[PDB]
Design a protein around this ligand. Structure first.
Ligand SMILES: [Zn+2]
Ligand SMILES: [Zn+2]
Ligand SMILES: [Zn+2]
Ligand SMILES: [Zn+2]
Ligand SMILES: [Zn+2]
Length: 250
C-alpha cells in the first residue's frame, strides 16, 4: 500500500512501462530516446542497447525476455532479445506514429497505430499484418493482451476502454466511468484491467465483469501515462509530467 518513486536516474518524460515475469521494470525514456530497465530491488538501472529511436513510446516484454518498443517518430516497431545487443525491425507496414505495444504468449505483437485509428497485429515469422475488428475507435493509445488472446485498447477520443474477445470478435466497452483521456492499460493475472486516467491524474482498476472501479492510491500524479502490474499485484505508473516512475506495493 506504500508509494515509492523508483531509483531511475536521468529520466526525461518516462512514457511506456512494462514488467517481466521476474518483476524487472522496463521504461521508455522519451526525451532521452532510450529504454531503461530496473530489476526488483536493484538501485542501478541498465540502459538497453537500442539505437536510433525517435521518441520511443510503448514497451512490452515477452515470456522469453524479448523487449519490444514502438519507435513513435520513425513509424516502426523494434525488438531486442534478452542479452542481445542488436535490435531487429519488425515488418509492420504503413504505420503512422505507433504508440502502444503488447505481446502474447505466441510472440504475436499488437500495436496501436495512433495516426491511422487502428490496432494491428503481426504474428512472429509472418510478413502480413492484421487490422483487428475494433469499431468506432477515435484514436487508440494503450494496448494489452491477456492469456485468452483478448485485446484491450484505450480509446482516446471516446474516453473508454474496449475489449475484443478472441474468436467471436465481440467488442465490449468496459464499464469504467468518469475517464478523461485514458492512456495506458494493463491486465493482471486475475483478469483485472488497469488504466491510466491521463486527464484526471489517476490510475483506475476494474475487475472484468464488475461495475466497481477502484482508484488506486497514487498521489500527486501529473499526466500519468503508462501502467504495468506484476504477478504480486504491484502497480507501476509512469508519471510523465513529474518525470518519475511510481511503484505502489500491493
Ligand atoms: Zn509521452
Ligand atoms: Zn502517440
Ligand atoms: Zn495518444
Ligand atoms: Zn502522456
Ligand atoms: Zn502512451
Amino acid at each position: 500500500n506504500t508509494q515509492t518513486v523508483l531509483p531511475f536516474t536521468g529520466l526525461n518524460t518516462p512514457s511506456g512501462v512494462a514488467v517481466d515475469s521476474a518483476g524487472t521494470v522496463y521504461v521508455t525514456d522519451h526525451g532521452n530516446n532510450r529504454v531503461v530497465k530496473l530489476a526488483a530491488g536493484s538501485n542501478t538501472q541498465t540502459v538497453l542497447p537500442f539505437t536510433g529511436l525517435n521518441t520511443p513510446h510503448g514497451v512490452a516484454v515477452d515470456s522469453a525476455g524479448t523487449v519490444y518498443v514502438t519507435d513513435h517518430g520513425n513509424n516502426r516497431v523494434v525488438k531486442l532479445a534478452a542479452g542481445s545487443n542488436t535490435q531487429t525491425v519488425l515488418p509492420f507496414t504503413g504505420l503512422n506514429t505507433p504508440s502502444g505495444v503488447a505481446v502474447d504468449s505466441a510472440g504475436t505483437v499488437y500495436v496501436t497505430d495512433h495516426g491511422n485509428n487502428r490496432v494491428v497485429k503481426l504474428a512472429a515469422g509472418s510478413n502480413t499484418q492484421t487490422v483487428l475488428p475494433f469499431t468506432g475507435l477515435n484514436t487508440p493509445h494503450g494496448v494489452a493482451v491477456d492469456s485468452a488472446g483478448t485485446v484491450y485498447v484505450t480509446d482516446h477520443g471516446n474516453n473508454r476502454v474496449v475489449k475484443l474477445a478472441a474468436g467471436s470478435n465481440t467488442q465490449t466497452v468496459l464499464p469504467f466511468t468518469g475517464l478523461n483521456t485514458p492512456s495506458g492499460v494493463a491486465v493482471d493475472s486475475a483478469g483485472t484491467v488497469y488504466v491510466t486516467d491521463h486527464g484526471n491524474n489517476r490510475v483506475v482498476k476494474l475487475a472484468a465483469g464488475s461495475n466497481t472501479q477502484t482508484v488506486l492510491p497514487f498521489t500527486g500524479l501529473n499526466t500519468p501515462h503508462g501502467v504495468a502490474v506484476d504477478s504480486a499485484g504491484t502497480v507501476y505508473v509512469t508519471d510523465h509530467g513529474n518525470n518519475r516512475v511510481v511503484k505502489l506495493a500491493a
